[PDB]
Amino acid sequence: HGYIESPPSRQQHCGAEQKPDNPSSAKCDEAFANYRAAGGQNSHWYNFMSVVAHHEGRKVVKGTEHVCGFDGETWNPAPYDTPANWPVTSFNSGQQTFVWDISYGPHFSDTEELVFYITKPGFSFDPTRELTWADFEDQPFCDESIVPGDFSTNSAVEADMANSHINVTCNVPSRSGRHVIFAEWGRNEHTYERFFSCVDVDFGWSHP
Ligand SMILES: [Cu+2]
Ligand SMILES: [Cu+]
Ligand code: NA
């Protein structure tokens, strides 16, 4: 059970930090409101660690209706599929570390891969519609696997047992303006259990 903590995923902002029954910030208000308007329940955001399936993820499974929720098991659509102006954090291309928090279900021992996709370079973020696969690159920009549970087998993937985190280092493609990263944490074939996390990032406008 997990989600991306850094950079903060939709589940980190709206889930780990802000809860709809007692928010301390306005940043998730639209996501919370639009989900209630669509018949979603406030209590669903308490399952921010549970965007889950039991299969090989987007490298294999091409037919999902939804991106961030991946037509998963806890709810479909997920809270995280809701069209909204989601909270966005400033981000840079090149070598970046992504931090999965797996504290609520620290399945280190049969972790197999961490996969990351980004929106196409010409993507135009639309807060009124759901993400579609046409918004995303066909292939992942970062796909790091280990012999299951053996983190010494990939120098890009680190287990932090003290924080119950997995740290993955990725080469983030050059981007400008507002983008989305779609990420997966997959366990091996014993379960094929896989967790999904979207990150809203703003690359700004900078060129040498
Ligand atoms: Cu943490
Ligand atoms: Cu779990
Ligand atoms: Na490693």
Side-chain angles (χ1 to χ4, degrees), residues 174-194:
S174 298
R175 287 292 183 275
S176 302
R178 193 158 165 173
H179 287 278
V180 181
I181 294 169
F182 161 80
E184 305 179 347
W185 163 42
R187 295 171 64 197
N188 82 340
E189 66 177 344
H190 189 75
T191 68
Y192 277 121
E193 188 167 86
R194 185 173 294 267

Side-chain angles (χ1 to χ4, degrees), residues 32-40:
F32 292 158
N34 290 356
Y35 190 61
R36 285 187 296 272

Side-chain angles (χ1 to χ4, degrees), residues 1-2 49 104-107 185 187 193 195:
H1 283 60
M49 69 292 293
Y104 295 107
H107 318 295
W185 163 42
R187 295 171 64 197
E193 188 167 86
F195 296 89

Side-chain angles (χ1 to χ4, degrees), residues 137-200:
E137 293 195 323
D138 292 339
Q139 296 294 320
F141 72 85
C142 185
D143 180 0
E144 296 295 350
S145 68
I146 56 170
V147 171
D150 187 350
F151 285 79
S152 77
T153 62
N154 190 332
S155 57
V157 189
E158 167 178 87
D160 171 0
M161 303 305 294
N163 289 299
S164 296
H165 290 178
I166 298 168
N167 305 320
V168 194
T169 303
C170 294
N171 182 26
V172 179
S174 298
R175 287 292 183 275
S176 302
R178 193 158 165 173
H179 287 278
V180 181
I181 294 169
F182 161 80
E184 305 179 347
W185 163 42
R187 295 171 64 197
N188 82 340
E189 66 177 344
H190 189 75
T191 68
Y192 277 121
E193 188 167 86
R194 185 173 294 267
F195 296 89
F196 305 88
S197 193
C198 280
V199 189
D200 293 285

Side-chain angles (χ1 to χ4, degrees), residues 45-64 66-198:
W45 301 91
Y46 287 75
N47 253 139
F48 57 90
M49 69 292 293
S50 309
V51 188
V52 65
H54 294 87
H55 59 49
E56 293 164 289
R58 178 65 187 172
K59 288 187 289 176
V60 173
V61 176
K62 300 301 187 184
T64 65
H66 309 277
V67 173
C68 298
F70 214 76
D71 296 8
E73 297 189 13
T74 308
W75 5 238
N76 183 29
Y80 304 104
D81 293 312
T82 306
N85 194 350
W86 289 87
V88 80
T89 59
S90 193
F91 203 57
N92 293 317
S93 69
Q95 295 290 114
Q96 301 300 333
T97 303
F98 291 84
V99 180
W100 281 80
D101 179 278
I102 71 168
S103 64
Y104 295 107
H107 318 295
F108 286 108
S109 71
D110 60 2
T111 286
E112 182 162 38
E113 60 176 21
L114 292 300
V115 189
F116 300 78
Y117 294 80
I118 194 164
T119 44
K120 294 190 161 84
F123 171 70
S124 187
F125 183 77
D126 184 349
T128 73
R129 70 153 171 92
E130 285 209 26
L131 295 168
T132 74
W133 292 115
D135 295 325
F136 284 87
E137 293 195 323
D138 292 339
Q139 296 294 320
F141 72 85
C142 185
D143 180 0
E144 296 295 350
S145 68
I146 56 170
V147 171
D150 187 350
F151 285 79
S152 77
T153 62
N154 190 332
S155 57
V157 189
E158 167 178 87
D160 171 0
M161 303 305 294
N163 289 299
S164 296
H165 290 178
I166 298 168
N167 305 320
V168 194
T169 303
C170 294
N171 182 26
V172 179
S174 298
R175 287 292 183 275
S176 302
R178 193 158 165 173
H179 287 278
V180 181
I181 294 169
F182 161 80
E184 305 179 347
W185 163 42
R187 295 171 64 197
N188 82 340
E189 66 177 344
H190 189 75
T191 68
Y192 277 121
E193 188 167 86
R194 185 173 294 267
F195 296 89
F196 305 88
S197 193
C198 280

